[PDB]
Design a protein around this ligand. Structure first.
Ligand SMILES: [Cl-]
Length: 127
């Protein structure tokens, strides 16, 4: 599915992402916008043989297991296929592990380049 902006904000808030590990909700909404355009089925292949999966473009080298990525670590202990559900539970649970690993939201390239440093609260305004 393709979430609306406020629709995703409300779901992410229900799943505990607002202010999680120091990142207000607008960060997470902005990240999803620029990672997946709010589509829970987005996938993108990378040069290292990994693929990024779902609404938060979670990577198959470090975080989820897709069975076809060399050097897989599966640190979220989740099959990547589960991260293509229209229900965001598994992607949120893995994102919480990613953002707790020691480099904050910098794991999300699109957030780093297109969200960080902007007024991210705008992404929840009006919701
Ligand atoms: Cl998979």
């Amino acid at each position: 599915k393709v979430f609306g902006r406020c629709e995703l904000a409300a779901a992410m808030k229900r799943h505990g992402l607002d202010n999680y590990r120091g990142y207000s909700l607008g960060n997470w909404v902005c990240a999803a916008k620029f990672e997946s355009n709010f589509n829970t089925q987005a996938t993108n292949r990378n040069t290292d043989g990994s693929t990024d999966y779902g609404i938060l473009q979670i990577n198959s080298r470090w975080w989820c297991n897709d069975g076809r990525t060399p050097g897989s670590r599966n640190l979220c202990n989740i099959p990547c296929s589960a991260l293509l559900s229209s229900d965001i539970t598994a992607s949120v649970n893995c994102a919480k592990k990613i953002v707790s690993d020691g480099n904050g939201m910098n794991a999300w390239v699109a957030w780093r380049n297109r969200c960080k440093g902007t007024d991210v609260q705008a992404w929840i305004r009006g919701c």
